[PDB]
Coordinates of C-alpha atoms and ligand atoms in Angstrom, one line a residue:
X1 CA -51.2 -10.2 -56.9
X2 CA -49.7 -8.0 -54.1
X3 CA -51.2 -8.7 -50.4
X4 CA -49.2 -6.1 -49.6
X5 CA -49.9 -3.8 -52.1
X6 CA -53.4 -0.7 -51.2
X7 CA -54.9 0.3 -54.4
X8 CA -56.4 4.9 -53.2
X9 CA -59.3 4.1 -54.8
X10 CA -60.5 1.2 -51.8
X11 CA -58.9 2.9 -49.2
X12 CA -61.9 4.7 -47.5
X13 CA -61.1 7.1 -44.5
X14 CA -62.6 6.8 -41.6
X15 CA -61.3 9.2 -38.8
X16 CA -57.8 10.6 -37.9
X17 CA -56.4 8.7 -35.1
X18 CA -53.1 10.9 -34.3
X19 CA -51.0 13.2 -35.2
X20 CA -46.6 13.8 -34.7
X21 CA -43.7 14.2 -36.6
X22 CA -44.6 16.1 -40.4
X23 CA -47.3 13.0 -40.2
X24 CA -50.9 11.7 -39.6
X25 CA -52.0 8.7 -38.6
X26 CA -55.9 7.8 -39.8
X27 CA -58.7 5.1 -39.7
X28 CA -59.3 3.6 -43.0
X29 CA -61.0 0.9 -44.6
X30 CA -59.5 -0.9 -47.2
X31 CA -63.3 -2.2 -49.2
X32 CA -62.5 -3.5 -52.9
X33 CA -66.0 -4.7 -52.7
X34 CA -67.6 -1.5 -51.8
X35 CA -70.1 -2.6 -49.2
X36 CA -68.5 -1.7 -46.0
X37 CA -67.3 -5.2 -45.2
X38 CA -63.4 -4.6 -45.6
X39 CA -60.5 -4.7 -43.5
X40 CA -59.6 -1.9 -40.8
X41 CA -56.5 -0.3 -40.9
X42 CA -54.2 2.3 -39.6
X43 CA -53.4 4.5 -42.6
X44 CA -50.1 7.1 -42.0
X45 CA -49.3 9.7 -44.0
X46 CA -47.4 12.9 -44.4
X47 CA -48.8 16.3 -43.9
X53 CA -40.1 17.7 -47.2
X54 CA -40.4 14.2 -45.1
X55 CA -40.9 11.4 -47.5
X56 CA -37.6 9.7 -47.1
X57 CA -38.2 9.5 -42.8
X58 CA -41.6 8.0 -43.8
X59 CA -39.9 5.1 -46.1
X60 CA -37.4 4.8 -43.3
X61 CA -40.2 3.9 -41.1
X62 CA -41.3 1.8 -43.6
X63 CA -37.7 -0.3 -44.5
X64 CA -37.9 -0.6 -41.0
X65 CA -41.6 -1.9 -39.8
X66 CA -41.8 -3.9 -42.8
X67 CA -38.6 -6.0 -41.0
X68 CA -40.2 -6.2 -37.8
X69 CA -41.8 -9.5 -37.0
X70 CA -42.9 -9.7 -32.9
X71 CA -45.9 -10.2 -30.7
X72 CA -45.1 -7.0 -29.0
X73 CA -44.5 -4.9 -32.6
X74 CA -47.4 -3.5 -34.5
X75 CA -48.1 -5.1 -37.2
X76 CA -47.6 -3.6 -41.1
X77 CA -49.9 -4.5 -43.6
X78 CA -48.6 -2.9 -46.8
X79 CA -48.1 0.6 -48.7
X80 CA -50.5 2.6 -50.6
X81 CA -48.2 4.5 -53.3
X86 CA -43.8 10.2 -55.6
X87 CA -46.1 9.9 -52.6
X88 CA -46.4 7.1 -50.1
X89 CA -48.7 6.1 -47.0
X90 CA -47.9 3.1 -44.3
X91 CA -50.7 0.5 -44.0
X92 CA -50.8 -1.0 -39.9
X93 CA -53.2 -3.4 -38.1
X94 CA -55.5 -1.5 -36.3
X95 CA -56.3 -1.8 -32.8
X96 CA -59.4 -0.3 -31.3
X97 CA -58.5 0.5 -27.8
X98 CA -55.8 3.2 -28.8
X99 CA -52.9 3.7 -26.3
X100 CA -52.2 2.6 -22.8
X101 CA -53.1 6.5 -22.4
X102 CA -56.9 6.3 -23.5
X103 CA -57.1 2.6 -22.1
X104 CA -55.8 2.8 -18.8
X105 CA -57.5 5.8 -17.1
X106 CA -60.3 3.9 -18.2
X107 CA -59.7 0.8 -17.7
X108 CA -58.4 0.8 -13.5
X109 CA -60.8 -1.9 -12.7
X110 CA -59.6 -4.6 -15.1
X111 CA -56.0 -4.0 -14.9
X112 CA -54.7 -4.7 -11.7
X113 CA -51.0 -4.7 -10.5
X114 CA -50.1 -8.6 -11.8
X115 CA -51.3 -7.1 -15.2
X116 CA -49.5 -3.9 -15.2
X117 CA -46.2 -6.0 -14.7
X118 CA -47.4 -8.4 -17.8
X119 CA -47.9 -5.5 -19.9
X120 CA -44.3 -4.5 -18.5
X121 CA -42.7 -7.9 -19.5
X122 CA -44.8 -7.7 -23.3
X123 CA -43.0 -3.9 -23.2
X124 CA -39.6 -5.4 -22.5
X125 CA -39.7 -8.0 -25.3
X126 CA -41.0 -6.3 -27.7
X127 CA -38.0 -3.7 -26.8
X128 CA -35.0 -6.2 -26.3
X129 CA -36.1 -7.6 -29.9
X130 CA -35.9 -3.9 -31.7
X131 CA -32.1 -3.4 -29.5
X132 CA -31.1 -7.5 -30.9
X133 CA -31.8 -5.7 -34.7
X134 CA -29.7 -2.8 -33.3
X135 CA -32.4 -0.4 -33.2
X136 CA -32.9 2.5 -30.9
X137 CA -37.1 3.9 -30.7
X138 CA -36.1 7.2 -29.3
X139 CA -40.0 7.9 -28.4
X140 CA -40.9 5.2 -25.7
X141 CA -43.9 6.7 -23.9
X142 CA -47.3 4.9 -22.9
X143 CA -48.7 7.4 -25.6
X144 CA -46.8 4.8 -28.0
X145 CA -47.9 1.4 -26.4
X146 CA -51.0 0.1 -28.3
X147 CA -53.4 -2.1 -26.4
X148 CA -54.5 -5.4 -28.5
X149 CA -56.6 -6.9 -25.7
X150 CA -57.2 -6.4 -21.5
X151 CA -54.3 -9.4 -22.0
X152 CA -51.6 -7.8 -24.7
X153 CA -49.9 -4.6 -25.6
X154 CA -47.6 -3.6 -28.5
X155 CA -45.3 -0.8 -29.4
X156 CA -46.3 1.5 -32.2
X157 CA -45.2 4.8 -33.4
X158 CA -41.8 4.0 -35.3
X159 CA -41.7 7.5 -36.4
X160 CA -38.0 8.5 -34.4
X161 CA -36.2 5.1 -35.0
X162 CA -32.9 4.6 -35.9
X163 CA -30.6 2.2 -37.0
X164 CA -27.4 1.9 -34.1
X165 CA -24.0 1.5 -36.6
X166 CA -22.2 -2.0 -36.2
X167 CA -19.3 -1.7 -33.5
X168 CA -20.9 1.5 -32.3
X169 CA -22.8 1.7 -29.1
X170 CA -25.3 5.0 -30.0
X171 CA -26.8 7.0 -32.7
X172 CA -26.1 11.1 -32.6
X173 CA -29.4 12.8 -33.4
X174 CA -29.2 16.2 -35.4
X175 CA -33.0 17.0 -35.8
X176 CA -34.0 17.1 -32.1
X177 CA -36.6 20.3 -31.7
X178 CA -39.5 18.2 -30.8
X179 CA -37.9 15.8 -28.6
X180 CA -39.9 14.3 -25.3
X181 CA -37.2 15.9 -22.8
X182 CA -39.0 14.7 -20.2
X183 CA -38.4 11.0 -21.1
X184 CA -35.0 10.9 -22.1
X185 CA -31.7 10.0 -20.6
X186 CA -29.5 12.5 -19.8
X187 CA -26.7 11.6 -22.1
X188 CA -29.8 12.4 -25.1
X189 CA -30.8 16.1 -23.3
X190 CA -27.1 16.6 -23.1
X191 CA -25.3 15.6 -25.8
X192 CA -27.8 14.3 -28.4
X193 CA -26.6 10.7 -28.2
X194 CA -29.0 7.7 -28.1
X195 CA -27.7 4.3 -26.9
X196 CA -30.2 1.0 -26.6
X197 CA -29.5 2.0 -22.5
X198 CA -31.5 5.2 -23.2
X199 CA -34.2 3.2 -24.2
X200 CA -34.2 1.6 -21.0
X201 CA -34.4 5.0 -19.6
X202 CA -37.5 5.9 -21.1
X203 CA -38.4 2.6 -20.5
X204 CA -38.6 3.6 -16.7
X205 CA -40.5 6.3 -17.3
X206 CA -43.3 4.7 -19.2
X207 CA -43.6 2.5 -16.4
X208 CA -43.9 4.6 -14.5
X209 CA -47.3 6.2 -16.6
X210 CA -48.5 2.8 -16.6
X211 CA -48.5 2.4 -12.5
X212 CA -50.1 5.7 -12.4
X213 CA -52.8 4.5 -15.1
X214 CA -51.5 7.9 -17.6
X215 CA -53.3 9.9 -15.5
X216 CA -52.7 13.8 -16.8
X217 CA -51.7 15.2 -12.8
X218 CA -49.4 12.7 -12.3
X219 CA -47.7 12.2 -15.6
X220 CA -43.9 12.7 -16.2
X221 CA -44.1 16.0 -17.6
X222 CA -46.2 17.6 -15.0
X223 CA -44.3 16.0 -12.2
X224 CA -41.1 17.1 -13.4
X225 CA -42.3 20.7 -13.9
X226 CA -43.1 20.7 -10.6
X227 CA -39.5 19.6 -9.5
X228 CA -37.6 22.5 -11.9
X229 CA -40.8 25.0 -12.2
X230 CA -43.1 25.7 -15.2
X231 CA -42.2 29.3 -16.2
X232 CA -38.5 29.0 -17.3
X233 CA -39.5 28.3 -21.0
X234 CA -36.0 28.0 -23.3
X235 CA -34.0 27.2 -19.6
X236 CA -36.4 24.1 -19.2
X237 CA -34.3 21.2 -20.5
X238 CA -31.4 23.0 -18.5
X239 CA -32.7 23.3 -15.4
X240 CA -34.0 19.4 -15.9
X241 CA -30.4 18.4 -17.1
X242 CA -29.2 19.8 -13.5
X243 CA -32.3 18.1 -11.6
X244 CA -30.9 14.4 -12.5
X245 CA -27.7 15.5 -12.2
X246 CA -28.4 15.9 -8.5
X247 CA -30.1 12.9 -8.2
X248 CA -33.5 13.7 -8.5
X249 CA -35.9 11.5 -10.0
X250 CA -39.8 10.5 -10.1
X251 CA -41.1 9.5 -6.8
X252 CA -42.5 6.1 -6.1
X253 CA -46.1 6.1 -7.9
X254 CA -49.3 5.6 -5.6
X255 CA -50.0 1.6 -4.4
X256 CA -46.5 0.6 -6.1
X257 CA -44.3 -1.9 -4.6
X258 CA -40.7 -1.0 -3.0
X259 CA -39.7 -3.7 -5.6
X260 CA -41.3 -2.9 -8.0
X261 CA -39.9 0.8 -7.7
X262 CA -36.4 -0.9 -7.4
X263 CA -36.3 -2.4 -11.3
X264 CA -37.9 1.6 -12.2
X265 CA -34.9 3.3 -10.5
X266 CA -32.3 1.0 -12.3
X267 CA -33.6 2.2 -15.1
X268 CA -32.4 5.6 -14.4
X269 CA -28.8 5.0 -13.4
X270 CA -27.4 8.4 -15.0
X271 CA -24.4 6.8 -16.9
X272 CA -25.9 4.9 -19.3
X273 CA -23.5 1.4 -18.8
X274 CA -24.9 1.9 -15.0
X275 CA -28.3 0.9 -16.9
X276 CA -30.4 -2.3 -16.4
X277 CA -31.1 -4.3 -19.7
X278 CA -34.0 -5.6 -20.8
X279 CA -33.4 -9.0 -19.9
X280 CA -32.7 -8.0 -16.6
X281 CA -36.6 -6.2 -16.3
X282 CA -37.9 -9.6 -17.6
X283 CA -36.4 -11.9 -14.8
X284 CA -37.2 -9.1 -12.2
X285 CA -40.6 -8.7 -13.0
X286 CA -41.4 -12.5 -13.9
X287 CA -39.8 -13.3 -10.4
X288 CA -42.7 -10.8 -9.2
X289 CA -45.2 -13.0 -11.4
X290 CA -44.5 -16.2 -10.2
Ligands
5JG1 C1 -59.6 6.4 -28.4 O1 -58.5 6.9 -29.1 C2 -57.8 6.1 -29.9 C3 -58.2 4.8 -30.3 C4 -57.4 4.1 -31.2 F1 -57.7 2.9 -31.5 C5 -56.1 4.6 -31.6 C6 -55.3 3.8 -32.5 N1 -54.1 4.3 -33.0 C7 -53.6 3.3 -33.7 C8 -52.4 3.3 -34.5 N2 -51.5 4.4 -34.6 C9 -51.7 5.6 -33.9 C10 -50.7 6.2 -33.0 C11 -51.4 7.0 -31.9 C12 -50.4 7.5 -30.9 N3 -49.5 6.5 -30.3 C13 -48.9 5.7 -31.4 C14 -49.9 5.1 -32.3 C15 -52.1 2.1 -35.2 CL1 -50.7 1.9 -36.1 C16 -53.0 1.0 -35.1 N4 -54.2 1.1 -34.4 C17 -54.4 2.2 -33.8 N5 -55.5 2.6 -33.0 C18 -55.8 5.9 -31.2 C19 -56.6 6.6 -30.4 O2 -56.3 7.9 -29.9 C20 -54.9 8.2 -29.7

C-alpha cells in the first residue's frame, strides 16, 4: 500500500497542459475504479533527460509549503511526476482574464504568497532559475503557488551560487546580469527575476507589455545571436522596465530594488514581505 505510488494502467490522459525542457506536462486522471470518478492530476513526462526529471523529483518530493505545488507520487527505466492540479493554469491565462477580480491589494497578496513560497525554496538552499508568471499557478481568486521545478538547483553549502553549464534555452530576459554574463545563479538572482514577474503580474501578462517585448523594444528585435549582448549592455547602463500602468511609486520602489545590478545590492525576500505587508495594512 503506496499512496504515493501511480499504477499506467489507471492513469487516464486527459489533455497536455505544457510543454519545456526535453518534457510535457499533461492532464490525467488517476480512476482505479474505471468510472470517471478519480482524482485529477498533473502528469509530467519526458519527451537523454531522465536523471533532470528524478532531480525534480528528489527535489519536489522535499518540498512542503502553501506557496509550492503540491506532489502526489511517481508513475514508474522510465519515470513520470504526479502534481495537484489546479484548473485555472498560470497567472498568464488567469490574469488577462481575470482584471476585474484582482485588484491592486490582491496583486500585492499574490506578491507576498510569491515571496514565501520563494524565501522557503532559498532557506533549503535552492535556486528556481525560471521565475516567471508563466510558472505561478493560481489555486483560487485568494492563492497562488510556484510550479515548474524543471531548472532548480541545489546552491553547495558555504557557497553563495550555482554555475550553470546547460544554458541554450535560458529566459534572458528574466535573469540577472551576473546569469547573462557569467552563468552564475545566486538566491539574489532569484530576487531578480522576482522583479520581473512582478512586474507581469501589475501588467495582468498582457503579451504587448510583457518583459520580452519591452525589452526588445529598448535593444531592437533584429539583432538575433547579439541579443543577450546588446541586453547585457542595456542594464549595464542603467536601463530597466518602466513603471507598469496604475502602479504605485512605492510599489515600483520594492520592483527596482529588485534589480540592483550587483547581486549583494539585492533586496531579500524578507525585505518584499515587510514592504508589501506595510502596503497591506
Ligand atoms: C488554461 O490553460 C491552462 C490551465 C491549467 F490548469 C494549467 C495547469 N498547469 C498545471 C501544472 N503544470 C503545468 C505548467 C504549465 C506552465 N507553467 C508551469 C506549470 C500543474 Cl503541476 C498543476 N496544475 C496545472 N494546471 C495550464 C494551462 O495552460 C498553460
Amino acid at each position: 500500500v503506496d499512496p504515493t505510488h501511480f499504477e499506467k494502467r489507471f492513469l487516464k490522459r486527459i489533455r497536455d497542459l505544457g510543454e519545456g525542457h526535453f518534457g510535457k506536462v499533461e492532464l490525467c486522471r488517476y480512476d482505479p475504479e474505471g468510472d470517471n470518478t478519480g482524482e485529477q492530476v498533473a502528469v509530467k513526462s519526458l519527451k537523454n533527460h531522465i536523471a533532470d526529471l528524478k532531480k525534480e523529483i528528489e527535489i519536489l518530493r522535499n518540498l512542503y509549503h502553501e506557496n509550492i505545488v503540491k506532489y502526489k507520487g511517481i508513475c514508474t527505466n522510465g519515470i513520470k511526476l504526479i502534481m495537484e492540479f489546479l484548473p485555472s493554469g498560470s497567472l498568464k491565462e488567469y490574469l488577462p482574464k481575470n482584471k476585474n477580480k484582482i485588484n491592486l491589494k490582491q496583486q500585492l497578496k499574490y506578491a507576498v504568497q510569491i515571496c514565501k513560497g520563494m524565501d522557503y525554496l532559498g532557506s533549503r538552499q535552492y535556486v528556481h532559475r525560471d521565475l516567471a508568471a508563466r510558472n505561478v499557478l493560481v489555486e483560487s481568486e485568494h492563492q497562488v503557488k510556484i510550479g515548474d521545478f524543471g531548472l532548480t538547483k541545489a546552491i553547495e553549502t558555504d557557497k553563495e551560487y550555482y554555475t550553470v553549464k546547460d544554458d541554450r534555452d535560458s529566459p534572458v530576459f528574466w535573469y540577472a546580469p551576473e546569469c547573462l554574463m557569467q552563468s552564475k545563479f545566486y538566491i539574489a538572482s532569484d530576487v531578480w527575476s522576482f522583479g520581473v514577474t512582478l512586474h507581469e503580474l501589475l501588467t495582468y501578462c498582457d503579451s504587448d507589455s510583457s518583459p520580452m517585448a519591452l525589452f526588445l523594444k529598448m535593444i531592437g528585435p533584429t539583432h538575433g545571436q547579439m541579443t543577450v549582448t546588446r541586453l547585457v549592455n542595456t542594464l549595464k547602463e542603467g536601463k530597466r522596465l518602466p513603471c507598469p500602468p496604475n502602479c504605485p511609486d512605492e510599489v515600483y520602489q520594492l520592483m527596482r530594488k529588485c534589480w540592483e545590478f550587483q547581486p549583494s545590492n539585492r533586496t531579500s525576500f524578507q525585505n518584499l514581505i515587510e514592504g508589501f505587508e506595510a502596503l497591506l495594512k
